[PDB]
Amino acid sequence: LGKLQDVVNQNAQALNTLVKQLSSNFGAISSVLNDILSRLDPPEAEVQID
Amino acid sequence: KRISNCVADYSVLYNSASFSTFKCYGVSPTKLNDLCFTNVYADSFVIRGDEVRQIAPGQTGKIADYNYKLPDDFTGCVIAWNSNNLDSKVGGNYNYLY
Predict the structure, then answer these.
(1) Chain A interface, Cβ < 8 Å to B
(2) Which contacts (CB < 8 Å, 24+ apart) does range B55-58 have?
C-alpha cells in the first residue's frame, strides 16, 4: 500500500530530522547547550546560546 | 603538561592572593569545578608586561600571532603573576627567547 505508507514514513522522517537538528551547532562552537555553559561564562556565551 | 587520572580542586589555585592578573576566557574556577572535565592542559611560558594585553581571543600583535595563536572558541583560563625576584638578575638576563 502506497497511500497509507507515505503518511507514516514522511512523519517518521520529519521526526528523525527534528532529532538530527539538535546535533548541529548552527554556527556555534558546540551542539549541546550544557557544554558551552560548563566551559564558558554565561555573560560571554550569550551569543552562542542565542 | 597533560593532566589525566588526577582528582583536584582549583580553589587552592585561586586563594593565593598573589596573582596580579587573572584571565579565564572560559568558566569561573568554581564553574569549571562543579562540572567534570575529561582532560586539562598546561601551557607555561614567560612574557613581558606590555604583551599580557595581546594574550586574548581575538587580538593581533607580534606575540599572539607569531608564537601562540588564540582561537575564537578558547575556553581556557590564563593565570599570570610577577616573580621578577627569581627569573631576573643584574647585568642583563638574556636566557629567555622570543
Answers:
(1) 29, 38-41, 44
(2) B55/B23, B56/B23, B56/B25, B57/B25
Contacts of B27 (CB under 8 A, 6+ apart): A38, A39, A40, A41, B35, B75
Pairing mode of beta strands B77-80, B21-24: antiparallel
Neighbour-count burial for B14-51, b at 16+ CB within 10 Å, e otherwise: beeeeeeeeebbbbebebbeeeeeeeeeeeeeebeeee
- What distance in Å separates the CA atoms of residue B96 and residue B75, rounded to the nearest whole number? 28
Resolved by: cryo-EM
Measure B67 CA to nearest chain A CA, in Å: 24
How far apart are alpha carbons B4 and B11 in whole angstroms? Answer: 19
3-state secondary structure of A35: helix
Yes or no, beta carbons of B27 and A39 under 8 Å apart? yes
Question: Inter-chain contact B27–A38, Cβ cutoff 8 Å?
Answer: yes
Do B82 and B21 touch, CB atoms closer than 8 A? no
